[PDB]
Design a protein around this ligand. Structure first.
Ligand code: THR
Ligand code: THR
Ligand code: THR
Ligand code: THR
Ligand code: THR
Ligand code: THR
Ligand code: THR
Lengths: 458, 459, 452, 456
């Protein structure tokens, strides 16, 4: 069986929805059983995120009806351009019903001045709940029968932890397999699940790709297709190297090491379940359906495969004599960053144990600076002597499964970096010699990636 | 003001105590103000540890009586060999006799009750230095200079009550010692020990004597701290591994810090810190080779790579995670789990995928770590750590040097060399201060690597 | 003068107008605090829960229409078209606020302690303006406020808010310099950020007192449907006469948990600054009434019906074994109120009394604290259901030899066996426990002998 | 089988030890199986307490040598008085010396290290009983019966690890003593102490020598437990207060416990519990009047049995705003006094619950005041703290008081007539005890009055 995910851009308008359905229908004639996972229409989640704060703060009753008319029109148009007056009618009722529902809650949070995380998750869920019926209708508007379902209905049962729910148990087989055994293409809302007692929950960032992975995992599928707006994964950002090419084949392991925080396509949560059961992931371009795309797979003669970059980040060094194991000073650093919700991109601590270096995003520096002040306070008194911060810095990451055991490669990567005129500020390579991460000045980003790419990829 | 510290081997016998007395006297002629810091005679601190546990466990007074006879002899012979003057010789003997009597009662005490609390554990170890110092002080008086012996607490080291590894609370070194110096007196301070508000003796821990010298120096604003040992300064690497290893003439505070790995021989970060803060140079000298120029640890001039440190037989732990990102404080909980369980972590690296953390610990701590980790998480549908892996029989090399900062090419040159040596790099950690590069290779390739590395970057 | 009016005192529009003339009569010599109408606060509670559980669209609509015509007819028979106008809308607005808040909880399905308190306040905000109205109608100037506007600053603790600051004179004085009577909706207070809080049961009295405290007022009047504090419950003894003068400390000792007229919290502020409290009947304003202020032996006899007597027996229960601490610890959680405590010189057992609907609650609590001589440190607990508390009260008893002897002999002669005795160090109150069968004969005898 | 307990005064000298041995011997003609629980000789436990304290503080070696000289001279004197036989005298002296040497060691130890752990504190205390035990065992031997001295733990009393006042964990009493009793051997067990699971000596606390007898009796299903003291049973009321005070011939388990205020001489609640549980009778007898009939605590049972008194005590009133049951206000009062270990003699709370009234020993007032404020108008919630220090507790005990209408009235009128004002009353559900407090000066005329009207 084939599970097929599409995101917000791919279902950006009625036209694109109709095009998605065409893609779906085409695959259905090659594969009997097809489950489609669908995101909210582009820029709907965000519209939803802000009215939620709009209702809580400014609290205007009309500003809500103003938002309602907007979603109404946005999706009314999609129905007109995706779909047959017959199907147009049934879908229009589903849409009206969800919109009535949506209005109420917003009116409620306005009236009370209260937006609990439970309420917050209910709002966001409407995005995908208004997308899926329109797609389902379009599938139906061609050859195949199709129904739309919520993540709960689909068998994704979660925590009570709203906004970022953990999945307890998958009941994917029980709900979908009967519907598949009957010919139906179920179109499942991505990004959302339910709790035992019926409450609607969201799955955080990368959620739709995650739902695709869970469904794929539960049904023990033959393949999971992540349909996006680029032709798979490139060897490096084409905005930096114009001659970059699609990677035909990636190992889960390699895909994992490329799936950094804030990456557009790859995420560890989507990859891990597919890796566990050995299910292939295929990244495809809905705007270029014929492209071979990137296959993330189990089997695997290259050394370096890809070069990922994280631009505009900051470098934080924590100085402190002692800082030696007899004191859980590291434990306290990360707690102070744990609270305050500061994401640590790289950690590096050398032999002396007198300092640890970290890279965070440049909007988190001051956030994490006051955090470390609150935990420690700044010889005869405390244990952090000094903190250092380097702004406008960047993380380059060289990835390839063939790097493991390959004597000499680090030497080559770094000699190259130097040959391009870049000074290495920090290096971090973990025990699975599959990823070498390092830090250089932003000025040198462009010339350094050009060289590495020229030397190691092409 | 010159602080001069002497360890166990430099004061390991009477002859030796007299030798370090002449060194102290010789510097007293160039520099008017000298404070000395001395450890117990070699083997003594160890001997005191064994008798403690023995008195607790077997509980035999005859063995205590025996131990006292060993201690008395050793120190009597020392006096008889350090000091020519009979009148001085009797003053020191007097002091020693007090301490033996006091030490005996504690030991008989612990045998009788079968209770060895940390407090008593510290009071006992204390006797090591409280028996050396008066002899060194005697040998100095014997040579013509005014001198008396003091305990660390008596000299201004006021500490926490955390016996065994006490933290320093107040530094009152200027209050006690300066009046002594002004009279022309060489105070000799028992290194490694402090005191508490109520006057309970405490110990400072591993490298305590060195720490005492640093505290005196910091407290006084000494012109120089001199650490006298049995080797001629800091070497470019372990001479056992490279026979043609040379003494580093000059070293920076950061370099020294970066060379002072946990469990190191001469350098410790506790010691280097106070000196760094007030900009007091540190000089490491050889007591048995007092002509060597040794290693000056000062402010900062050319050199890329200065030294290579090594850490034999450690272990590499990789923790593969479910997400392990900035929304789930997994890193916080890892280091907390190993904090409790008292597990010291030598290296850390986390790559940009944020999906794994690699750390190296000591190979006796592996089992402690795995148990500790399994306690905090307990190993798709179950927990937040996917799996943990371990590599035994590995080692850490660190290349250290201030000139490496901004030295485009050096990291490339180092790792290519390592590779040329016939070695695969298992993990890299280099920090924002481009002064140290640490990596991990198999124990198999330690010797070959350090040889090649030293030949190409030092000599 | 701070006159307080309650639920049944403002029961209908007539009642409100009757109340309105009373205040007008007071003003001739020289601040009025008001509660809500009868069974209105009890209704808001049920509609709150209604709108949380069933959250029914039709079942809410009928509620506001109820309190529409409840208050619409209250305007009819309480109030000239000068003043009838500025209540209709002045209450329609407050209703559509309540309706929106109510439909607010109906849509979201979440009732915070904050939302509850905001809902509960409406009761008083629906009653107050109407009274303010009939004060104007009778030719006297009047304004209707709100606890917070009057300066009752409270905790963040919704339902039972601890008072933190008082802006007494600072908000009320200028209105008094104008001839306006401030008609203040009591029971409710505020946060520093304007969020309405409630004070708990016996709150409208507290509010009245708090006004008195900060102003250092001349008098505090509590207007109810009984002619003051009686010598005993008149429903049991028909010969029960009213108490004219009651000591501060005496009124406190006559106030048990769940009592009607008196309240220790409300008594407290008045006892501090030394402000008299008068209680008078609204159905008979001519009556003398009880005056709580700063002779004779026994003053009054209070009674608590339908209680239970737990007895905790354990060998040990001494000093180092702090199970006394744990009995109450278990009873503190599970929200169990203890009426009486006794422990003899042996320290082996402790006797308590609680409402006889708390036993199973209190037992389970005790069992989840001790494993119930080689096991736990408590041997056994025993209970006596259908039992009652009688308390004799008088400051004249303090240092008066004989009264206790005589009291218990009087009890004896009524045919009653005493199960438990507790007398505090102040000697103002004597409290003992007897079978329920005996309560009627016992109180009558006691009152027959020591009051009349 | 019979267990027989003797206290410090009853073995206050060697002659008295022989006298006890004579008592134990006489009893062994009647009952074939007797076990004896013995305390330390009079004044020895006290001597041990202040010396082990002394060794901690002054750390004076010479003052230890005096204590041993003292203890040795006391017990050698005792041995020579109690025993006639030279060979027994010889073997008892050898025991006593080995024990005293052990004592010296530990006392030296505490002085040398300046440390007195609760564990060591217990080991030292255990010596008093370990020194008197073998003298008495020897004394029985000299009179013709087979006997061994045993430590409480060797007898099967296994306890906590909470030194100084341990709780019992298991009884191996039957396993240890039954093979001895089947051979005419009189085990004399050191009262007051027991062992830890890993063989560490622990003490049982105040009244712990009586409790030993009880634990033995429980563990052996004894037929009779005998507490031998220096008074002919338990009196109706303190003899020092009423001259013509008679011995109470019989007492119930429940009456016995109401008479046992924390500090009482003979009766202790913890001692009564086991005997109550298995229905084993307790007989209290007079070692200096062996012909008395004493007081029997028992099952099988006109109105008021006894008047109990607690002298020179104090009472505290806790006035507060609201102080309702809704909040955990009462809990915190007792937690506060739980820490700093303050014993509450009486508690009282009226229907107002605005105040609570407790009684504590007068030498705890400040020790209770400070700790209360350290736990805690509009600022706090506890308003006042009144206090007296010129008071006592009187408690009238009788089983036949329950359901006896009018007795409380009769009692408080009697108090009233004697010339005393009642400051507080407390009566429990089990109407076996009415406790109350009056001015100290009134105790004499009050107790005398109560005794007149309600005893004979
Ligand atoms: C994110 C991806 O799945 C989607 N097609 C998009 O680009 O919006
Ligand atoms: C600093 C060192 O790691 C690197 N070779 C550089 O200078 O760029
Ligand atoms: C450690 C050093 O200072 C000492 N002299 C030694 O050789 O032991
Ligand atoms: C660095 C590491 O990835 C590789 N095995 C090397 O030694 O070059
Ligand atoms: C509370 C009281 O004042 C009111 N009149 C009532 O009886 O309801
Ligand atoms: C005196 C005494 O009998 C009574 N209880 C009193 O009021 O003090
Ligand atoms: C037990 C007896 O010897 C002791 N004198 C007492 O009366 O308590």
């Amino acid at each position: 069986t084939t599970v097929m995910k599409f995101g917000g851009t791919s279902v950006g308008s009625g036209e694109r929805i109709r095009h998605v359905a065409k893609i779906v229908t085409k695959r259905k004639k090659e594969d009997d059983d097809v489950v489609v996972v669908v995101s909210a229409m582009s820029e709907v989640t965000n519209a939803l995120v802000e009215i939620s704060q709009q209702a809580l703060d400014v609290r205007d009753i009309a500003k809500v009806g103003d938002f309602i008319k907007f979603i109404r029109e946005k999706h009314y148009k999609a129905i007109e351009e995706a779909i047959s007056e017959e199907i147009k009618e049934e879908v229009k009722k589903i849409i009206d019903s969800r919109i009535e529902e949506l209005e109420k809650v917003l009116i409620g949070v306005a009236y009370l001045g209260e937006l609990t995380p439970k309420s917050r998750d209910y709002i966001l869920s409407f995005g995908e709940r208004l997308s899926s019926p329109i797609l389902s209708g379009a599938i139906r508007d061609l050859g195949e029968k199709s129904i739309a379902l919520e993540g709960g209905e689909a068998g994704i049962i979660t925590d009570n932890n709203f906004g970022s729910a953990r999945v307890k148990r998958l009941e994917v087989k029980e709900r979908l397999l009967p519907l598949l055994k009957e010919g139906i293409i179920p179109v499942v809302t991505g990004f959302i699940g339910t709790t035992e007692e019926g409450y609607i929950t969201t799955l955080g960032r990368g959620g739709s790709d995650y739902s695709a992975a869970l469904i794929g995992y539960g049904l023990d599928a033959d393949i999971i297709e992540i349909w996006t707006d680029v032709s798979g994964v490139y060897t490096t950002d084409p905005r930096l190297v114009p001659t970059a090419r699609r990677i035909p084949k990636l190992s889960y392991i390699e895909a994992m090491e490329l799936a950094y925080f804030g990456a557009k396509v790859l995420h560890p949560r989507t990859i891990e379940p597919a890796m566990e059961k050995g299910i292939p992931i295929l990244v495809k371009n809905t705007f270029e359906p014929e492209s071979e795309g990137t296959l993330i797979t189990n089997d695997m003669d290259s050394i370096v495969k890809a070069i990922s970059t994280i631009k505009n980040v900051a470098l934080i060094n924590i100085f402190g004599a002692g800082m030696v194991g007899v004191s859980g000073t590291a434990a306290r650093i990360f707690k102070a960053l744990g609270e305050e919700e500061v994401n640590v991109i790289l950690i590096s601590q050398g032999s002396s144990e007198t300092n640890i270096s970290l890279v965070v995003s440049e909007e988190d520096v001051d956030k994490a600076l006051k955090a470390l002040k609150r935990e420690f306070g700044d010889l005869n008194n405390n244990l952090i002597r000094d903190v250092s911060v380097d702004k406008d810095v960047c993380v380059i990451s060289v990835v390839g499964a063939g790097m493991r055991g390959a004597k000499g490669i680090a030497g080559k990567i770094f000699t190259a970096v130097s040959e391009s005129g870049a000074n290495i500020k920090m290096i971090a390579q973990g025990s699975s010699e599959v990823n070498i991460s390092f830090v250089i000045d932003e000025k040198d980003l462009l010339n350094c990636v050009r060289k590495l790419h020229e030397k190691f990829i092409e």
